[PDB]
Structures are given as structure tokens and as C-alpha cells.
Amino acid sequence: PWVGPKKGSWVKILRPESYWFQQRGQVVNVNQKPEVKYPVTVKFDSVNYANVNTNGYALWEVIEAPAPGPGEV
Amino acid sequence: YTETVADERLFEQVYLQYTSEYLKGPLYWHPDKLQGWLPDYPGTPMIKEGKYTSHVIGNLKAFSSNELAFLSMLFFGVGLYGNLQFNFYDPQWAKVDAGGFFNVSYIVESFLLPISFFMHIACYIQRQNGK
Amino acid sequence: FENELGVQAPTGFFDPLGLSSDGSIDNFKRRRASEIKHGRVAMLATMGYMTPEITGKFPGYLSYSQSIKFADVPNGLAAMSKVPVLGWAQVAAYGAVCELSQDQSPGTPGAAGDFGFKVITSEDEETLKRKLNSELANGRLAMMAIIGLFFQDGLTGGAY
Amino acid sequence: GRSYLIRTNDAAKEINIDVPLAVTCMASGFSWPVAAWQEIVNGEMAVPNDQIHNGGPWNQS
Amino acid sequence: XXXXXXXXXXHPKHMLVAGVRGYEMEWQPIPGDAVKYPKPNSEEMFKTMIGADVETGGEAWDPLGFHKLFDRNFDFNMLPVYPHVQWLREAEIKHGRVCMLAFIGCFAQAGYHIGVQPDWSKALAECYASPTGAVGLFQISVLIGWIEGKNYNGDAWVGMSEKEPGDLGFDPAGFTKNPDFDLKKAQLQEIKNGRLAMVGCASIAANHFIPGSVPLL
Ligand SMILES: CC(=O)O[C@H]1CC(C)(C)C(=C=C/C(C)=C/C=C/C=C/C=C(C)/C=C2C=C(/C=C/[C@@]34O[C@]3(C)C[C@@H](O)CC4(C)C)C(=O)O/2)[C@](C)(O)C1
């Protein structure tokens, strides 16, 4: 039984200290081990100050938002 | 059984939900729970049900809505009369300039306009609570 | 709407133009309260035309600033342009406080005793209806009288 | 500028300008006082605050 | 098959906005103002409101989209700064009534008088500057105060007015107490006449201060 958002599905970030808070990014993969605290891996078009466009988030920090659309983060 | 991160998060949620309810009770005694701090004064609840309780208007809490409405309109009339009869009609400036004295009735009445404003506010607050 | 107070001797349910054949109970209560209030106002009004005319004419001023005196104010229609306007607005106030001190207990005007403004009712229903009908008949007559005194005042200069 | 940015949702198009599209938007900008208002009232200019980064966190504990 | 996330590991999302209570609280009890929780419905209820007629199209005529600004409030600052269509209709009919009175007032005062005399564009400023038997200003102002203190339009700003817009319950001589009488048609005629009187009053006001603007005075 798959857990978390599907691969390639857009999710809105709910981590307040994240550089992409309330932004959206494609789900690269979700780790299926229940022991992993932050299994969801999300990649973004906008890099942060460390020039990193991907990060691993918790299961409770992604809400499966729709596609961004024209001129929308 | 091993404690997965989901189980730890579940314990976090249970602990927070229980403790946030417990600390509101009479068994936590934090300085932020003193009188003059966040909680309302014991016998004088200000806001309940998202409506100004009758205790907001202080000593007027026992007044009826009709009494407050009558006082509000009467004070509005008297204070507006005083202001208009002191500023524009029957000016007192020339009379007091030549050594005279103010018409004390005008001065006393003119202070009843903001009193009337707050009186009609209190009338509405009383009407909301059904008093 | 017959069997309600108001139908006594010279006419029964009087309505020539209807206005109550609809049977709206809420409408009748408001009309009844209006009819009684007008009468009650008119009855004091008819007293207000008789007394200052013949005598009374309260000693004093009624306006110390304008130097008016009660004797100066003409009786009847001409007063409402001679009584200082501050007096009329205060009459509206004294009416209002009693409009919000004479609270209504049931459906139609009540809660003052015979005219006692805590007095109690007339108890015996025969007197309860007889006095209530007497108030209505007196009030209606005064209503017709005060407009007649208004017309008489206009027709013949002063109030009489 | 806003029209070009909306129609080129890529960083590659900001360093290497799509000149035909750029001049197309430049010529199309004359009707801005009407198109901009029609976008304002029809919910196509602004974006709800819950879709862009509000700012730094000020609380959590 | 995707496993359902337990409530322990669910998400808060951002359904909780600045216009509503947060996790658990009650909003501030404001007196008569925008109260209660707003919901987007202005444009939708605007397409059901009557007033549209064949002079301009036949559907809901609103270029500039002033109706929709309430629905946008949620996108903008998430605050109902712009009124709902219910408040807009209340303003519609209030302006219409006031104009239908005011236009014939302008006409009558230029041809009628009572026992002070001063133009029409300076009649009020004169009456507010020379009281001799002019308690009529007091009576008119207290009537206005009582009327729109009693008939203050509830919570029309956020579209939650229980009273139908413009329905003050003033139908003394049973003019349209009929079950429908096409009450839509009577209301439409009222709105058309109110708009016409608004245009007339605007024409007169703009002409008196811009000479030769509107044909005839
Ligand atoms: C379906 C239906 O019917 O619904 C209706 C039913 C209801 C509820 C009953 C109803 C109502 C009530 C109504 C109409 C009230 C009517 C009011 C009438 C007012 C009367 C007045 C002003 C009296 C006068 C007296 C005057 C005197 C004038 C003179 O002194 C003058 C100057 C000069 C003198 O030389 C000559 C003079 C001649 C002596 C004057 O000029 O005026 C309502 C609300 O309308 C709805």
C-alpha cells in the first residue's frame, strides 16, 4: 500500500522555515520505510540560497496541491 | 513493536491535546493566568460567544436596552444642541472676550455628545444580550 | 373582529370601509394600540385647549433666556410657532421616556392601572369591560373634538 | 514585462530573450488600462497569500 | 492503492485564513459592521439579482466588474474591503429613492415655497445657517437617523443580510401586496426610475457647477 503523495504529483510545502513554504514542487520519490521521519522528496524550480532545488519533507508537510500554472509559484 | 516516527508524532498530538486542555483549568497556576493577565477577571467576563457580555458596560450592565436608547438619544440631542449653540449659533466668544462669562449650560451640555456615542454603543451591547 | 372592546351602543362593528375585514389579528392589535394612544393623547389635548384658555396660565416664564412668559404664549395653534423650539423637542423627550417606561405587557395597551402612573386592574370583569369601553368612547370623542378645536382655531382667529 | 514573464515561465527565456515574443508583448501592452482592470476584477492578477511565501516564521515552539 | 494518512500525520493546510478563527478561538465581537464569516458569492448572486434590462444587453450589466470585487477580497488581502452585491443593491435603491425625491424637490423649490428662500444648490447651507422657525432640519435629520438606525442593512456588506435589499417593509397602501403581481417587474420599474433620477440629479449638480455642461439648466 503506497503511502504519501504519488510520484510526480505536485505538493504544497507546509514547513514554515522552508525556503519554499507555501510553494509547490514535484514529488521525486517517497520513502516507504515507516522508520523514516522525512520520507517525501520534493524538487523545485526555484533554488534556495544554497543553490539546492530539492529537499526531503515529512509526511505532514505536503498537501498535494494542483499544478502551478502560468506565472505562479 | 518499534516506535516509528508516526507513533512519536501521535504521542506529540495526544500530549498536546491533553495538556492544552489541562493548563486552562484551575490546576496549572502560571503567571500569565493572573488577574490583569490573559484570563478575564473572576466575576466580570467581558467576551463570551463572540459577543460583548453585559459586564463590558460596567455599572450600566443593569440598565435596560430601552433606557440606554432613550439616554443615548437624549444625550445626543442635548450635546449637539450645546455644540451648535456654542460654536455657530449664539457664539460665546465675543461675550466672554468683553469680560463676560460662558453660558455654563452650553459647556455642560456639549460634553454629552461623546457620552451619547458611548451610550448608544452600550444600548446596542445590551440589546444583543437580550437585556 | 367584533366582540372586541369598542362596540357598545350607537353602532356595532362600525367599519363602513372595512379595513378590518381581512381579519389580520396582528394588524388589529396595532390599530387598537394606535386608536387608544391617539385618544389618550387627544383627551389630554382637549384638556390642553380648555384650561389655558379660561385660567391657569402658569405664573413664570417657561423661557427665561427669551424672556417669554406663559401668559405671553397664545393658546391653541399659534403656540407651536411661539413656544420656544427647545420646549417642543423636550416634550418629545418626555413623551419618549414614557414611551419606554410604559412597557406593554400583553397584546393591547396595558400595565398602568385605571390611569395610575403600581396600581392593579379593575378585577370585576363587568367593570373591566365597561371602563375599557368608556376609555375608547371618550378617546374617540376627544379625537373628533381636538381636530374640531384645531378647525375652530383656524376659522375664528384665537382658539375661541 | 509582466506579460512576457507570464508567457515565458522559464529562466532560460530571461537571459536569452525570445525577441519575437518580447516585441509581441511590447506592442500588446497598449491596452493595459483595460486588460489589467479586467484581470483585477476577474481574479487573474492577484494571488491568494496562501500560494506565495509569506515570509520568515515568527513562531512555532 | 494509496494508504490513508492517519489524523496523527495529517496536514493543517491553509483553510484557516485571517478572516476566520484559527485553530480554536472566537473572533472579536464587533458591533454593527462586517460580522460573521464571509463566503465568496457576490458574482453568483449578482447573476440572479434583478435590474438587468434591454437598454444595455439584457444580462447582468456590469462592465468594470464592480460586483466581483467582493469575491476578489479573498484573493487580495483575504479581507472584505469591497462590499458584496447585497450592499451594492442597498446603495442602488437608497440612491434611487433619494434621487427620485430630490429631483422633484429641485423642480418644486424652483416654483414653490413655504413660510427660507435661497436657490436650490444653497438651500440646505442657508437653512443650516439661519434658524428662526427652522426646526424642520432637526425633524428631517431625526427621521433620517431613526429610519436608517432601524433599517440599517444588517450584514449586507458580506452578503448575509436576512432582509431583502431595499425591503424596508414600507408598503402602506397595499400597492403590490399581491402574491407576485410580477413583483420582479415592479422592482425593475423602481430600479429603472431610480437610476434615471440618479442621472438627472448628477446632471443638475454637474451643470450648476460646470456652466454649459448639460444642455439646459
Ligand atoms: C389600505 C389603507 O387604507 O392603508 C392605510 C390605512 C391606515 C393604517 C389607516 C393609514 C392611515 C392613516 C392616515 C392616512 C392618516 C391621515 C392623517 C390626516 C391628517 C389630518 C390633518 C393634517 C389635519 C388638518 C387640519 C387642518 C386645518 C386647516 C386650517 O387651519 C388652517 C390651516 C387655516 C384655517 O383658516 C382653515 C383650516 C381648514 C381650519 C389642516 O390643514 O390639516 C395608512 C398608513 O395610510 C395606510
Short mmCIF file of C-alpha atoms in Angstrom, two decimals, chain B residues 73, chain E residues 90 94 97-98 101 139-154 163 166-170:
data_model
loop_
_atom_site.label_atom_id
_atom_site.label_comp_id
_atom_site.label_asym_id
_atom_site.label_seq_id
_atom_site.Cartn_x
_atom_site.Cartn_y
_atom_site.Cartn_z
CA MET B 73 -30.85 59.86 22.00
CA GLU E 90 -28.91 48.55 -0.91
CA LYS E 94 -31.30 54.05 -1.44
CA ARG E 97 -35.28 56.68 -3.73
CA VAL E 98 -33.29 59.70 -2.55
CA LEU E 101 -37.36 62.59 -4.13
CA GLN E 139 -37.13 66.83 12.37
CA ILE E 140 -35.78 65.71 8.98
CA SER E 141 -32.43 64.71 10.46
CA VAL E 142 -34.02 62.74 13.30
CA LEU E 143 -36.34 60.99 10.84
CA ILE E 144 -33.29 60.02 8.77
CA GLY E 145 -31.42 58.87 11.88
CA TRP E 146 -34.29 56.74 13.16
CA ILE E 147 -35.03 55.33 9.70
CA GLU E 148 -31.51 54.10 8.97
CA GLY E 149 -30.86 53.14 12.54
CA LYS E 150 -33.86 50.82 12.49
CA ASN E 151 -33.36 49.78 8.86
CA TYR E 152 -29.58 49.55 8.95
CA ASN E 153 -28.94 46.80 6.45
CA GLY E 154 -27.90 44.09 8.90
CA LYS E 163 -33.66 41.42 4.84
CA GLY E 166 -34.22 47.71 -0.25
CA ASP E 167 -37.12 45.95 1.52
CA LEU E 168 -37.83 48.24 4.46
CA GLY E 169 -41.35 46.86 4.87
CA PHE E 170 -42.84 50.19 3.74
#
